[PDB]
């Protein structure tokens, strides 16, 4: 499942858009618009669990990548939106603790909108693209070809093991 949850200025989901056909079958039947990120993560992971797109008994990996462009402020100061973004990431990390608790690895990556745009033209989701980000940070040569064809299990494993083995 590959999904992009648009979050609007009310700290609610504007629209949910799947990038993978299996994720379409996850989104169907779920109200996600007046939910927060943690809510969406929980809805998506739990439906993927039922449907067999993620295993509860088997070891998996979930990547929550959030990309945020703050080009607005409103009120009298941009800290109004920054408090919303604080609550946003507050909510994101709580989902991680909730969904990973079953013995599944869940991780958080942060991206900018410019990174989101790069993943859109390659029609890939931001989670797998965020492992590509870590490849660039650790100076490992992973290509966009690698990222789009590979499994997220392989992607997170190779990057986090790179930072473990010398």
């Amino acid at each position: 499942p590959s999904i992009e949850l648009w979050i609007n200025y009310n700290n609610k989901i504007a629209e949910a858009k799947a990038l993978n056909g299996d994720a379409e079958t996850v989104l169907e039947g779920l109200e996600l618009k007046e939910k927060t990120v943690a809510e969406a993560v929980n809805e998506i992971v739990q439906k993927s669990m039922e449907l067999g797109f993620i295993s509860r008994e088997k070891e998996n990996i979930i990547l929550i990548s959030t990309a945020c462009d703050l080009k607005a402020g409103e009120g009298s100061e941009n800290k109004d939106v920054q408090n919303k973004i604080g609550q946003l990431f507050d909510d994101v990390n709580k989902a991680v603790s909730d969904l990973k608790n079953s013995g599944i690895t869940t991780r958080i990556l942060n991206l900018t909108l410019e990174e989101r745009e790069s993943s859109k033209e390659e029609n890939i989701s931001m989670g797998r693209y965020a492992v590509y980000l870590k490849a660039k940070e650790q100076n490992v040569n992973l290509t966009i070809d690698e990222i789009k064809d590979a499994d997220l299990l392989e992607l997170i494993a190779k990057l986090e093991h790179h930072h473990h083995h010398h």
Binding site: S2, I44, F53, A67, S125, M126
Partner: peptide, 10 residues
């Protein structure tokens, strides 16, 4: 405009 959350599973 605000945030975009990418959820990748598998």
């Amino acid at each position: 405009m605000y945030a975009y959350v990418g959820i990748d599973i598998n």
